[PDB]
């Protein structure tokens, strides 16, 4: 459940975006969207908790947004450290949270 | 406020009458509460004391 | 005891309601609050209650 693109790429120094989309119930009803980074073979990491707020330790390169039944992360100032998978998890059905399939980032 | 997400289910009784009652609480449990500012209430009891 | 967890305020009551057809009764339930519910008389403190 919940749709996400498969992959995205760009050169160093560029900025890219990763999008997530769901029904009017999951993402359209609440501002509860969070983005998790995962390097391969590692536990995920914690990037964005509410749709456009960061925790401590996360760079300002990352920022999020919402529009209607869809939301998207923004990665700015690309470098080799940003080569990792990114998943979105958002408020789901009744009292649940549903997570997307994930997007891979390739820095040329 | 009443934080919890009550549902509502109808019980058919007799010729066409229905009786609506809670069916489930799809979420977590809560406390019903009412909030008042402490500063404003202190003012509104100080002035009532003066008057 | 909604979903492995206790709720202190609401009782899950089950009662035999009458369908549209006078002959056939149906077993039905609904979550009644406390205050609305009182223990029933002439029983040895069992789980029998009334409105």
């Amino acid at each position, epitope marked *: 459940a919940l749709t*996400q693109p498969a992959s995205v790429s760009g050169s160093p120094g560029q900025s890219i975006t990763i999008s997530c989309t769901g029904t009017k119930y999951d993402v359209g009803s609440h501002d*509860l*969207v*969070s983005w*998790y980074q995962q390097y391969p073979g590692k*536990v*995920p990491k*914690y990037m964005i*908790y509410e749709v456009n707020k960061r*925790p401590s330790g996360v760079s300002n390169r990352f920022s999020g947004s919402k529009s209607g039944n869809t939301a998207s992360l923004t990665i700015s100032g690309l470098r080799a450290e940003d080569e990792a998978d990114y*998943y979105c*998890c*958002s*408020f*789901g*059905g009744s*009292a*649940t*949270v*549903v*997570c*997307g*399939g*994930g997007t891979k980032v390739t820095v040329l | 406020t009443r*934080p*919890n*997400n009550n549902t509502r289910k109808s019980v058919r009784i007799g010729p066409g009458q229905t009786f609506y009652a809670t069916g489930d609480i799809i*979420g*977590d*449990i*809560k*406390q019903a*509460h009412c909030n008042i500012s402490e500063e404003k209430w202190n003012d509104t009891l100080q002035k009532v004391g003066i008057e | 005891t*909604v*979903k*492995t*967890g*206790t709720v202190e305020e609401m009782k899950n009551c089950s009662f035999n309601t009458t369908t549209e057809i006078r002959d056939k009764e149906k077993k039905e339930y609904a979550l009644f609050y406390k205050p609305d519910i009182v223990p029933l008389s002439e029983t040895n403190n069992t789980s029998e209650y009334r409105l």
Partner: nanobody, 126 residues
């Protein structure tokens, strides 16, 4: 800092059922929800259920209704998750994660704020 310890790797035949265990450290156990997550090998994250350690209330996704049950022991300071009717497709990494903050006045259960993640444990069905 805070750490979430989990059980070691597991191996099973189909239909055996497994009770995975989690043990948070560094914060009061009953101050934050516990959210259970799954990651099949090569697949994306999937959400299983959340738990209220203060009162044991829990909820699970529609595709695990009855198939999964989770409980806890506040004295030990640990949480358990029983998965039932194992198939070969249940081979996955299982994560124990720290959710929102419990409070009596607003439902923070469904908030996707997984602040701290367990090390993850591999369950194998074959």
């Amino acid at each position: 800092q805070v750490q979430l310890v989990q059980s070691g790797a597991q191996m099973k035949n189909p239909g055996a059922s497994v009770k995975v265990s989690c043990a948070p450290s560094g914060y009061t156990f009953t101050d934050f929800y516990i959210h259970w997550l799954r990651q099949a090998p090569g697949q994306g994250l999937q959400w299983m259920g959340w738990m209220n350690p203060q009162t044991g209330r829990t909820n699970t996704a529609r595709n695990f209704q009855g198939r999964v049950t989770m409980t806890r022991d506040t004295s030990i300071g640990t949480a358990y998750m029983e998965l039932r009717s194992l198939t070969s497709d249940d081979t996955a990494i299982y994560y124990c994660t720290t959710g929102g903050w419990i409070s009596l006045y607003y439902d923070s259960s469904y908030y996707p704020n997984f602040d701290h993640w367990g090390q993850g444990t591999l369950l194998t069905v074959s």
